[PDB]
Write a protein that binds this ligand. Sequence first.
Ligand SMILES: CC(=O)CC(=O)SCCNC(=O)CCNC(=O)[C@H](O)C(C)(C)COP(=O)(O)OP(=O)(O)OC[C@H]1O[C@@H](n2cnc3c(N)ncnc32)[C@H](O)[C@@H]1OP(=O)(O)O
Ligand SMILES: CC(=O)CC(=O)SCCNC(=O)CCNC(=O)[C@H](O)C(C)(C)COP(=O)(O)OP(=O)(O)OC[C@H]1O[C@@H](n2cnc3c(N)ncnc32)[C@H](O)[C@@H]1OP(=O)(O)O
Ligand SMILES: CC(=O)CC(=O)SCCNC(=O)CCNC(=O)[C@H](O)C(C)(C)COP(=O)(O)OP(=O)(O)OC[C@H]1O[C@@H](n2cnc3c(N)ncnc32)[C@H](O)[C@@H]1OP(=O)(O)O
Ligand SMILES: CC(=O)CC(=O)SCCNC(=O)CCNC(=O)[C@H](O)C(C)(C)COP(=O)(O)OP(=O)(O)OC[C@H]1O[C@@H](n2cnc3c(N)ncnc32)[C@H](O)[C@@H]1OP(=O)(O)O
Ligand SMILES: Cc1cc2nc3c(=O)[nH]c(=O)nc-3n(C[C@H](O)[C@H](O)[C@H](O)COP(=O)(O)OP(=O)(O)OC[C@H]3O[C@@H](n4cnc5c(N)ncnc54)[C@H](O)[C@@H]3O)c2cc1C
Ligand SMILES: Cc1cc2nc3c(=O)[nH]c(=O)nc-3n(C[C@H](O)[C@H](O)[C@H](O)COP(=O)(O)OP(=O)(O)OC[C@H]3O[C@@H](n4cnc5c(N)ncnc54)[C@H](O)[C@@H]3O)c2cc1C
Ligand SMILES: Cc1cc2nc3c(=O)[nH]c(=O)nc-3n(C[C@H](O)[C@H](O)[C@H](O)COP(=O)(O)OP(=O)(O)OC[C@H]3O[C@@H](n4cnc5c(N)ncnc54)[C@H](O)[C@@H]3O)c2cc1C
Ligand SMILES: Cc1cc2nc3c(=O)[nH]c(=O)nc-3n(C[C@H](O)[C@H](O)[C@H](O)COP(=O)(O)OP(=O)(O)OC[C@H]3O[C@@H](n4cnc5c(N)ncnc54)[C@H](O)[C@@H]3O)c2cc1C
Lengths: 384, 384, 384, 384
Amino acid sequence: VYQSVELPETHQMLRQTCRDFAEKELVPIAAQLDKEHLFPTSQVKKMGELGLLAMDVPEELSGAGLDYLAYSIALEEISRGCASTGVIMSVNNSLYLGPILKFGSSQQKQQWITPFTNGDKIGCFALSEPGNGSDAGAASTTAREEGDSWVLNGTKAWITNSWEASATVVFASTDRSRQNKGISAFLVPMPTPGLTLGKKEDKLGIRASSTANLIFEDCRIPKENLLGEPGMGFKIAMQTLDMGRIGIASQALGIAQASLDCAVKYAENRHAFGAPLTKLQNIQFKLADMALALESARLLTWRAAMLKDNKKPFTKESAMAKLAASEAATAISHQAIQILGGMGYVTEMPAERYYRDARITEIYEGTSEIQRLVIAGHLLRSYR
Amino acid sequence: VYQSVELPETHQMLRQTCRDFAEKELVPIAAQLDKEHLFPTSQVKKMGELGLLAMDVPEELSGAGLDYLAYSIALEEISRGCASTGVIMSVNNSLYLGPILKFGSSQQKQQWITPFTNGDKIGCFALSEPGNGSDAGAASTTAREEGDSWVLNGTKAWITNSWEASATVVFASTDRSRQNKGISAFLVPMPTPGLTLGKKEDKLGIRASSTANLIFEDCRIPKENLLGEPGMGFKIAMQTLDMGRIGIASQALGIAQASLDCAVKYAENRHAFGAPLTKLQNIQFKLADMALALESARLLTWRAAMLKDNKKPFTKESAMAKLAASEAATAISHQAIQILGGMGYVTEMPAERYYRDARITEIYEGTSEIQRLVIAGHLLRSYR
Amino acid sequence: VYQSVELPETHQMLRQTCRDFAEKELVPIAAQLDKEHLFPTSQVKKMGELGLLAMDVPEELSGAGLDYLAYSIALEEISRGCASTGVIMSVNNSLYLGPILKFGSSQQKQQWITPFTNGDKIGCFALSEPGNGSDAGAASTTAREEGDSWVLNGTKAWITNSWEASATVVFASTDRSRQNKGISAFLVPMPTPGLTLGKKEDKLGIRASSTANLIFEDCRIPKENLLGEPGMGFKIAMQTLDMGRIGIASQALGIAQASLDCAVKYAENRHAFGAPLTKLQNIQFKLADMALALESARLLTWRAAMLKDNKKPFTKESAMAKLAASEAATAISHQAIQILGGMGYVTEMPAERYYRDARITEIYEGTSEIQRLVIAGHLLRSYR
Amino acid sequence: VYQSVELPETHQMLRQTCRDFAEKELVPIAAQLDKEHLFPTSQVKKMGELGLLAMDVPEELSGAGLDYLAYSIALEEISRGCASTGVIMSVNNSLYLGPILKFGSSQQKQQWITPFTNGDKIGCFALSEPGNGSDAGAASTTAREEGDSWVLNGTKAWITNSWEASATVVFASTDRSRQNKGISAFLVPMPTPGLTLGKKEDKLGIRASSTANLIFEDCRIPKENLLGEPGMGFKIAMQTLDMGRIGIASQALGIAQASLDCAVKYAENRHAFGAPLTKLQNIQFKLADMALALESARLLTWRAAMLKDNKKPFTKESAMAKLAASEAATAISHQAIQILGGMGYVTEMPAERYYRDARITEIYEGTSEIQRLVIAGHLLRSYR
Ligand SMILES: CC(=O)CC(=O)SCCNC(=O)CCNC(=O)[C@H](O)C(C)(C)COP(=O)(O)OP(=O)(O)OC[C@H]1O[C@@H](n2cnc3c(N)ncnc32)[C@H](O)[C@@H]1OP(=O)(O)O
Ligand SMILES: CC(=O)CC(=O)SCCNC(=O)CCNC(=O)[C@H](O)C(C)(C)COP(=O)(O)OP(=O)(O)OC[C@H]1O[C@@H](n2cnc3c(N)ncnc32)[C@H](O)[C@@H]1OP(=O)(O)O
Ligand SMILES: CC(=O)CC(=O)SCCNC(=O)CCNC(=O)[C@H](O)C(C)(C)COP(=O)(O)OP(=O)(O)OC[C@H]1O[C@@H](n2cnc3c(N)ncnc32)[C@H](O)[C@@H]1OP(=O)(O)O
Ligand SMILES: CC(=O)CC(=O)SCCNC(=O)CCNC(=O)[C@H](O)C(C)(C)COP(=O)(O)OP(=O)(O)OC[C@H]1O[C@@H](n2cnc3c(N)ncnc32)[C@H](O)[C@@H]1OP(=O)(O)O
Ligand SMILES: Cc1cc2nc3c(=O)[nH]c(=O)nc-3n(C[C@H](O)[C@H](O)[C@H](O)COP(=O)(O)OP(=O)(O)OC[C@H]3O[C@@H](n4cnc5c(N)ncnc54)[C@H](O)[C@@H]3O)c2cc1C
Ligand SMILES: Cc1cc2nc3c(=O)[nH]c(=O)nc-3n(C[C@H](O)[C@H](O)[C@H](O)COP(=O)(O)OP(=O)(O)OC[C@H]3O[C@@H](n4cnc5c(N)ncnc54)[C@H](O)[C@@H]3O)c2cc1C
Ligand SMILES: Cc1cc2nc3c(=O)[nH]c(=O)nc-3n(C[C@H](O)[C@H](O)[C@H](O)COP(=O)(O)OP(=O)(O)OC[C@H]3O[C@@H](n4cnc5c(N)ncnc54)[C@H](O)[C@@H]3O)c2cc1C
Ligand SMILES: Cc1cc2nc3c(=O)[nH]c(=O)nc-3n(C[C@H](O)[C@H](O)[C@H](O)COP(=O)(O)OP(=O)(O)OC[C@H]3O[C@@H](n4cnc5c(N)ncnc54)[C@H](O)[C@@H]3O)c2cc1C
């Protein structure tokens, strides 16, 4: 329901295919997945076969050989069907495969990427800890080197996919005297001796995805599991987040789109005072504001995705898309419930689920406050 | 807390009683009530014993003999402890006893008010129907006079307290062609022949309260169950809602206060980048805005209550309070989640429930759009 | 201070050239133009020589032979230097030349377009009247046919460029029984017998441009001055406004950009509490919100400009850009004054002028309320 | 109008007096005052005669003997007629007489208060300097005790009433190394040797009032001109501003009320699409929001006034009022222009002036950001 300039036929086809999939495989089960906190095993597998779980990964590594513009469009359509399935997909793409593909060695790419491109295995990203999330550099989890292996100790918090993943990219302190400059990234298989999973979190939204802590107690891994060079941890997490934030913005657009779709359809069929709700000036103004917010957020998101594809700096653009999209999702999903009235408050309709799923997009992968700090830093830098 | 002008000792003292009650009886069980959708039977009875279920009712009729200012203050403290308990209380006070006290005959007051003041029995308000909520005058439920009896037929929708009430005030048309001028109000005992309850509605918030349809199939009630004059029903519904809206304004103030308390307490303990969150300027600004919106909405609410007590017009003032408070509750509870970050998205903290409960205040007893219409109508009337 | 994907070198050069012009010719005199309500005669002429006054017009007609994407970029840079000069340019491009180029005959193009492409002569657009502006179809000005000429009678209101134009495209009723379907467009030379100019309006902003009524008293024009077919008036005004709204959105981006520029520069030099204002978290968040709003508005504007170039429908996109850009201009210019503090309230700085100039973008060429109606109409149509 | 709880006859009566005064003496000349930057000499004297320039001053000292509630009410009515006249009045009341009445010796009260209560003479408040406004404790102006005299040196900036005042309360440091603990307050007569006025500042709004720098070059004043104890100056400045902010809150309420009155009156007369603007739902919604924000801010203002009168702490409550009212004045005056459409952008109507005057209320006597800081500080103090 939005018009774009001249999108490549490859991307237009991709959009149609994902919309059909979401409409056929996700829409009818989204409610039950949310209610039962059930991981969409079968759906994720089918997605992998379509190559949706490794969109940016080249053909050589068994990837889809597409780009981030394609990734954003596909993620929106999927998230429109089920926000949980959308993040599960975003995590494997941007957060797991993303950093390995960019910083890993030929060998690491072959053993940690290839096995996670078809849906049989998915990864996760472990940066946050109980004592710190926004304050990323304050990593307390440590990694000691013991000759031909590293020994990890500490607790990681809020790990998405933790209960279904077969590997994780964890960030630990290897040199405390350098603080945020003494952090390193490590590839850890799951399960593995010394690694324990915390209890699943009971959350407001995206309840189909798992969220738990990762407890490391003298967990040993080979020395070669180090990703990049020692002390490169913070930079890797940051550049990885620049990519991931484009993914979360895309998930947000999908939730917002589903909300607008539901609101419009309901308003045209629901009568009040002898006519459809769409005859009320107020309802029109709302739908106008909702559409504007969404289409603006999509353009920002697409700009960021394209800058990444063209190999241009995109940290600020990524933060702007994530911020605008997430805030638009909550506002738009909020108005959808409003337009539905009483029907918007009950589980019979999906409006309340959209409201609950949207709320997380304003928090993870960097809260809105942090995105604003990031934007100001780059904005001022361009003025200096 | 907030600083008030100079409340009478009775009201200042009442505030303390209700806050201690909420703190001891509601706060510790609020999470369980929400999770189990459990009606707080023991607590409602206690509140009944305290005289909180019939505050504006004179002592002669077994009421507490207070006023709406006290009602507002008491309802805020209760709702801060549990939003469901608060609406259960507001319904009995404003929607059930209110209309009977104002338009009931001496005999109706003895029969229908007295047995509902101690917490053994409570009532409900049945105006809305599946096909109309905002458009209150389009009721399809009918009532025909069969000599010594009225016979009711139709379906009322969204009735709060429906599964626990012993009486209801229903609004039915006696001549559907006369539209909103053919509506009359009736008192119906529950249970009773010809009246069945719909299944409980599964909702986003205030889940400890029941919500369901009331189905009338040739339900016969004595001729004297007519409340007021025939065709006076719409007016009775409208004036009753003017009182009820001050009640919902008070409930919203409670959810908003509970939210602020949670945000402040957490903000002073949680550390980020070396210091408490309260040291961050942005955090300080959010708290300031949260405080302003809440104290501001409380003054509007108290104003409406006092006008009501002084027997002055208060329709516009009542709509302003309900509107400002309901929107503040959602904005403040939204920000409380943000300030807690990840912890605000999980059930371990109460913030997510506040967000859910707050959402309904912008919808029932007249949506925000309806409030705005009512406000605009009276405003214009003041200039002409 | 914004990053775009891959802009054609032709447009990048065009941007640089206009920025230099604005910086050299407009920035240093903008204040005096605003204070004295002085039309920038010399500047407009230089602009014409650069071909800025006929950007969309093909080379054959003595135009610049560019497109609307080029037009938007050039208009932003110019408006950043002086909002008045920007609208004077927008009017000649989109409102005067625009409709003649699209609906005029080969002959009309030669005598009404060619002489208005170099800066010696500029046109104006007369649709609004004292009794109606938003309600466009309610044209009261009439045109009677007298064989080989038309006779115009009535008053046109708020005509920009009226005191400096040499021609105007006026809309008059030729058939009152068909109302908004009985309006026709006419080309009228200025001066001409029967046409009188009203007194110049004293306005809040864009004071360098002239605004006055056009009084027609038995004003006769040749029959061939009719533009398009009889009754085609409304459609021509509407399609013309779709183009013009892209121009006003562009002017808005320029005012917003100048506001952001001023705010950033001032905040980095002004100290408070021992450090630049840019060290205060609050100021950072503001600048972040201002940049986001502006870059979002620019993308919307560019999308609309490009759809017009590609010959695709753009009415909704045009309305969205105009709305978002104008509202962003007022918010951003408002925060610029705020960040400057006392300095933002005095004429020594340009911040207050930006605030005053921005306010008009929310009104002319369709108020924000009307843009919202337009958007909803198309949004719903796409859902039908 | 608005419905109040139950004002004492004195205040209800005072409201009428001030409204009739504003209606007859200010409204008809407000446009000329703004346009000519003319200080309303005749009117200030009249207000002096009515006792409006020294409302909180006891009768023994020639004051009207009222309170801050009356002051607030009277100031709103005056500001509705002319925003400049209102600030001239607020300065004399809160910023000049306020500090002298609270910290002055018996003799200082007779010498500096009495001659300034009838409108023949008025005072000003000199705290800010070119290098600091928000950072009040960074004053560079110095005062050294030369035995029987103090000698002042420095520049105070932005002084309201500077060109018409006969006395000023200046804040100067006695030891710049002690920062905000080395500030003292002094009473300085005007004119006087060593004191020159800077040129009048040309500003966006409240143009009938004067604003200029005060330049001290070895200005000698008697030893007894010290207000309070040495080093007590910062505290005196802060407590004085707590009173002054209730004043600015009242002025903003006046500009906002004048704006609403203009919007309603115009909305009922202007026709569009067949009926009055008031028939359009969107117009009704704006008026409703405008009314809510204004009555809401008035209650906050009255609360602060009453606390002040009851000798209770009111710093936080005073900041909330000034903040909410100032922001409401800009939002409401902005919407008034929108509702008038084209007519709101020209000087023929007063809406554009309201917009201009409203803008300053968010800046002086402490910017909105400062108010928020003060609010957050006291809020947190209530929880600890
Ligand atoms: C599925 C999910 O739900 C996933 C999860 O959410 S993932 C976890 C999400 N967590 C976050 O996003 C955390 C938010 N925090 C951040 O992004 C950052 O910690 C921050 C913006 C607050 C900055 O942190 P900081 O400690 O102040 O570091 P700062 O001083 O800005 O930067 C330190 C270094 O990193 C570099 N850096 C920062 N961002 C960078 C980027 N995008 N690319 C490369 N380098 C970068 C800096 O340039 C600097 O390098 P030098 O000074 O050595 O040149
Ligand atoms: C626990 C819970 O959650 C409880 C539930 O929510 S309860 C159900 C809540 N539903 C609502 O609040 C519905 C919202 N709707 C309304 O308030 C109204 O339907 C409305 C404002 C939209 C107006 O409806 P309308 O059909 O246009 O009627 P309108 O023309 O305004 O009024 C009709 C008559 O009623 C009168 N009236 C309206 N409001 C009145 C009031 N507050 N007091 C007295 N009379 C009133 C009018 O003066 C008019 O009188 P006449 O024509 O006889 O002279
Ligand atoms: C420099 C300056 O400052 C310039 C000035 O501002 S210029 C003056 C600016 N004035 C405006 O922008 C006025 C705002 N008003 C409008 O745009 C319109 O009057 C409106 C949106 C309110 C709609 O008006 P309306 O009377 O309700 O007409 P509506 O029923 O929507 O449309 C009537 C016909 O015009 C057609 N139409 C509308 N927009 C159209 C467009 N963009 N292209 C083609 N046809 C269009 C409709 O399809 C319809 O045709 P049919 O029914 O015959 O198929
Ligand atoms: C007509 C007009 O237009 C008039 C003009 O505007 S008048 C000029 C307006 N300027 C302002 O309003 C300036 C805004 N700034 C302020 O209010 C303050 O400078 C501020 C809130 C930013 C705080 O400043 P600060 O330097 O950080 O001082 P802070 O640490 O808060 O306070 C220092 C001392 O003053 C005291 N103080 C602060 N506010 C106080 C109050 N309202 N009452 C009493 N004491 C107060 C503190 O308790 C503290 O005491 P000790 O340290 O001695 O125990
Ligand atoms: C459902 C869910 C899934 C998650 N999945 C993952 C995952 O897969 N992997 C992973 O690594 N992490 C994950 N997280 C963690 C997430 O990244 C953090 O929750 C988030 O970054 C915020 O950190 P926090 O919870 O510690 O909040 P805090 O950092 O404690 O922040 C609290 C508040 O203070 C504000 N704040 C903090 N610092 C500043 C500052 N400098 N300036 C201004 N304001 C500031 C924040 O904006 C927030 O409003 C997940 C969280 C959730 C809820
Ligand atoms: C938990 C819950 C409990 C409830 N309890 C009760 C109860 O005890 N008793 C009872 O009688 N009812 C009850 N209700 C019903 C409630 O009053 C209605 O849900 C509410 O009034 C809205 O009506 P609706 O749901 O039919 O929405 P609709 O009336 O269909 O409205 C949908 C949307 O259109 C808008 N709209 C409608 N008309 C207009 C208009 N003229 N102008 C502008 N916008 C308009 C609405 O504002 C809303 O945004 C309850 C509802 C809920 C969710
Ligand atoms: C500086 C300036 C320059 C101008 N230059 C030109 C020019 O060159 N050429 C030209 O032809 N015109 C010009 N105009 C006129 C301009 O297009 C109109 O002023 C504008 O369209 C609004 O019309 P109006 O002033 O009659 O306001 P009105 O139409 O009276 O509107 C008043 C209010 O009601 C609202 N409203 C109206 N209809 C509706 C509706 N259906 N639904 C909801 N809300 C509605 C409006 O949004 C507005 O808020 C200019 C105006 C100004 C101020
Ligand atoms: C018409 C007019 C009349 C005036 N009359 C008087 C008068 O009679 N007497 C008098 O003494 N003064 C007077 N002033 C001055 C007034 O008090 C200051 O303009 C105001 O306090 C802001 O100070 P500033 O202009 O130096 O701005 P700055 O202090 O430089 O501030 C600029 C921006 O930075 C922000 N900022 C600064 N510090 C902080 C912080 N800690 N946290 C967050 N944000 C911050 C401000 O909020 C503002 O947005 C007047 C000003 C005007 C415009």
